[PDB]
Design a protein around this nucleic acid. Sequence first.
RNA 1: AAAUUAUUAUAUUACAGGCGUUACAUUGUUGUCUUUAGUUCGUGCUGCAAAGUUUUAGAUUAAGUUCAUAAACGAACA
Length: 66
Amino acid sequence: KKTHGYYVSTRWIPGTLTNSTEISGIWEKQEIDSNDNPTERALSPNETSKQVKPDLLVVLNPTENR
RNA sequence: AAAUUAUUAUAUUACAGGCGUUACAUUGUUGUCUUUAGUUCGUGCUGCAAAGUUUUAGAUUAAGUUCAUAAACGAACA
Ligand SMILES: [K+]
Ligand SMILES: [K+]
Ligand SMILES: [Mg+2]
Ligand SMILES: [Mg+2]
Ligand SMILES: [Mg+2]
């Protein structure tokens, strides 16, 4: 919340990054400006299926998240 | 403009007809049982590879009954 980031506390689905289109394509994306405010522009179906890859991954328990 | 064509009857010959054979040559239908949370496809992942996809020989119910879970995640039909 304080970094405007994302988190996963329940389970890492194997393939979330390598098989992203079969796992995360259905979920909604949004466009934001430099102030992190939603632009409200409707997204083309092309832009809503593209993989959205994290720029940085922080892992609290790496021994259980190989 | 008497020949043509229609119908009908008769005749003619290819045949028609056959509960004749063959359900073990067939269409279709039906009887009986059984498997029917199972197949294939897509992507991902493991193994040099043929292959495998792993927890799990999960829990629960009279029973897929209901639920949980795993490097797997979906889709499609059963
Ligand atoms: K017979
Ligand atoms: K496969
Ligand atoms: Mg005959
Ligand atoms: Mg007879
Ligand atoms: Mg290989």
